[PDB]
RNA sequence: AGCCAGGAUGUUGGCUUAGAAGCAGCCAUCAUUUAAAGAAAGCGUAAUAGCUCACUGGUCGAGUCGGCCUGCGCGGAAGA
């Protein structure tokens, strides 16, 4: 079972997202279901190691944000154009 | 795959045969000929028993860690090598006979062929069966 | 010996050494495998 | 040598080569040679790299060429002044942006594909990396 | 000796013990001549392999002659004569590499369990069975 | 890592059937025998020998091995 620790993003946009990726994190979004989308930031290397497994993109993941556990599914991934890095991940709820 | 737990299991699996059967033996590593060593091992596996295993997991730590459940004097892992061979047809069987006869004949060394007496009360030839 | 800009181990016995700031390949097996500069 | 048959215009503006690439995923095969640099790939370079791959892997498996030149490059002949019209088309190049997957290979072991891509990469003017296909 | 002192491996089938005319001078390191090549091998290899695969020992003893422990009939000559198909490797994928049946292996064992042995007699039978079946084919019988 | 050592006698392998020689072309073929026999490593590779792919045992007691990313360096680097 994959457990991801997330933080709610305070700032969003081009400048903030690039600052995250310089800080070795990367933005992610949790949407789907009935409640509002949740913009989160993930620590890049731990998620990159986890996503190396093929089952990362099939099983249900749990995201630990604000203490609250969220069952999510990897919906989409934005990879760096030529580097082994993640730029953004879409998470659909459940 | 001689790992940490694997050698832990190897010692226990090798000591189980000793605790269930009779005295075992070993064979050192000084010089080996193709025909000489193979035929001796082939003959040993035929007479003493096909369950003979020349595998050696008798390191100075692994041997004393697992095997020492019974006969705590089993800390003699000083041998140059180990090649085990059980003796199903009684104690001091052809396994002991072949080892004691090949310790100085048609072989380089047999790790002195010390033997593992079950009670270890004393060292005896046990070559007499009055009847 | 060879003074190529790209020096590599040509066989198993080639060793890479860095004498005097120059990266050399020394082989105990093939004198043809002696290469000079990194 | 790849070249568009029956192009609409003979000559083309020089243009620029800004931005990142589009075909950045291993789409057809399982292994890819991705360009981490920027530049032009001529038809000759593409053919030379393909032959290096096709010989390293002895014509086994399938090799895809994701890039097609489709850009005519003109040159003026030697000892001609500036002006007097645009030069004659001499060769064709594919504009390459970082992230562009250039070749795809399938039906080949991973280490053999890596060595095949190394031989092909030595024929190319752009820095490249070895990439494998990913789930999503 | 089975462990040939000069094991220059070039010897025609057991019909003629180590025929140097068929081996040529590339295995000339041997010193076999009429003194120690047509005395023991040419007289004790009749019921072992008649025109079948059986290597000939090129050993030379230290007693001015050549005489030491030989072995039983060759497995490659018994398990194949009791099978019929004289094929094997090299063309084992396109066609059968020979017949390796339970009867053929048992006969090979019953013929080669005299001196050619391993960890047991059944182990020698396993060697005979492998020598027949590993050629590239085995019969389901 | 170094050191105490080893690894066919069915097996010129059934094998391109004159073998291509325990490791030429030759296809697979531990084939129990395993501290080991791969039907192949440099020697002999067309071939004996003593070293010896690999592989362990034995010794002897803290790490060792490769990758990936990244900072700064090294070679590549010859003119009047
Ligand atoms: Mg800006
Ligand atoms: Mg100097
Ligand atoms: Mg520099
Ligand atoms: Zn070298």
UniProtKB/Swiss-Prot annotation, chain A:
Keywords, in A-Z order: Ribonucleoprotein, Ribosomal protein, RNA-binding, rRNA-binding
Question: Does this entry carry the keyword rRNA-binding?
Answer: yes
Q: Which InterPro entries match?
A: Rbsml_bL25/Gln-tRNA_synth_N (IPR020056), Ribosomal_bL25/Gln-tRNA_synth (IPR011035), Ribosomal_bL25_short (IPR020055), Ribosomal_L25_dom (IPR029751), Ribosomal_uL5_bac-type (IPR020930)
An MF annotation (GO) of this entry: 5S rRNA binding
GO CC entries: cytoplasm; cytosol; cytosolic large ribosomal subunit
Which BP terms in the Gene Ontology apply to this protein?
A: cytoplasmic translation; negative regulation of translation; response to radiation; ribosomal large subunit assembly; translation
Q: Does the keyword Protein biosynthesis apply?
A: no
Its biological function? This is one of the proteins that binds to the 5S RNA in the ribosome where it forms part of the central protuberance. Binds to the 5S rRNA independently of L5 and L18. Not required for binding of the 5S rRNA/L5/L18 subcomplex to 23S rRNA.
Family per record:
Belongs to the bacterial ribosomal protein bL25 family.
NCBIfam families named among the record's database cross-references: PRK05943.1
Oligomeric state and partners?
Part of the 50S ribosomal subunit; part of the 5S rRNA/L5/L18/L25 subcomplex. Contacts the 5S rRNA.
From the Swiss-Prot or TrEMBL record, give the protein name: Large ribosomal subunit protein bL25
Q: Which organism is it from?
A: Escherichia coli (strain K12)
Taxonomic lineage per UniProt?
A: Bacteria, Pseudomonadati, Pseudomonadota, Gammaproteobacteria, Enterobacterales
Recorded name of the encoding gene: rplY
From Swiss-Prot, chain C:
Q: Which organism is it from?
A: Escherichia coli (strain K12)
One MF term in GO for this entry? rRNA binding
> Which keywords appear in this protein's UniProt record, sorted alphabetically?
Ribonucleoprotein, Ribosomal protein, RNA-binding, rRNA-binding
- GO biological process terms, semicolon-separated: cytoplasmic translation; translation
For this chain, the family text in UniProt reads:
Belongs to the bacterial ribosomal protein bL36 family.
What is the annotated quaternary arrangement, including any partners?
A: Part of the 50S ribosomal subunit.
> What PANTHER family does UniProt report for this protein, alphabetically?
50S RIBOSOMAL PROTEIN L36, CHLOROPLASTIC, LARGE RIBOSOMAL SUBUNIT PROTEIN BL36C
The cellular component terms of Gene Ontology attached to this UniProt record, alphabetical and capped at eight, are: cytoplasm; cytosolic large ribosomal subunit
Q: What is this protein called?
A: Large ribosomal subunit protein bL36A
Checking PROSITE patterns in the record gives: RIBOSOMAL_L36
Entries under NCBIfam families matching the protein: rpmJ_bact
Q: What does this protein do?
A: One of the last ribosomal proteins to be assembled in the 50S subunit, it contacts a number of helices in the 23S rRNA, acting as molecular glue. The simultaneous presence of uL16 and bL36 probably triggers ObgE's GTPase activity and eventual dissociation from the mature 50S ribosomal subunit.
Curated annotation (Swiss-Prot), chain D:
> What does the annotation say about its assembly with partners?
Part of the 50S ribosomal subunit. Cross-links to the A and P site tRNAs. Interacts with assembly factor DarP(YjgA).
Q: This chain belongs to which protein, by name?
A: Large ribosomal subunit protein uL16
Q: Which GO terms describe its molecular function?
A: rRNA binding; structural constituent of ribosome; tRNA binding
- Modification after translation: Is hydroxylated on Arg-81 by RoxA. The modification is nearly suppressed when E.coli is grown in anoxia.
* Keywords assigned by UniProt, alphabetized: Hydroxylation, Methylation, Ribonucleoprotein, Ribosomal protein, RNA-binding, rRNA-binding, tRNA-binding
The keyword Membrane belongs to this UniProt entry's keyword annotation: no
Does this entry carry the keyword Lipid metabolism?
no
Any GO CC annotation of this UniProt entry: cytosolic large ribosomal subunit
Membership in a protein family: Belongs to the universal ribosomal protein uL16 family.
**Swiss-Prot/TrEMBL GO biological process terms:** cytoplasmic translation; ribosomal large subunit assembly
Q: Gene behind this chain?
A: rplP
From Swiss-Prot, chain E:
N6-succinyllysine modified-residue sites:
71, 80
Pfam families xref list: Ribosomal_L11 (PF00298), Ribosomal_L11_N (PF03946)
Show the SMART domains listed in the entry. Answer: RL11
Q: Which residues carry this modification: N,N,N-trimethylalanine?
A: 1
| Residue positions, PTM N6,N6,N6-trimethyllysine | 3, 39
* This protein's UniProt keywords: Methylation, Ribonucleoprotein, Ribosomal protein, RNA-binding, rRNA-binding
Molecular functions per Gene Ontology: large ribosomal subunit rRNA binding; rRNA binding; structural constituent of ribosome
Subunit structure of this entry? Part of the ribosomal stalk of the 50S ribosomal subunit. Interacts with L10 and the large rRNA to form the base of the stalk. L10 forms an elongated spine to which 2 L12 dimers bind in a sequential fashion forming a pentameric L10(L12)2(L12)2 complex.
Q: Which family does it belong to?
A: Belongs to the universal ribosomal protein uL11 family.
Please give the name of this protein. Answer: Large ribosomal subunit protein uL11
Annotated organism of origin: Escherichia coli (strain K12)
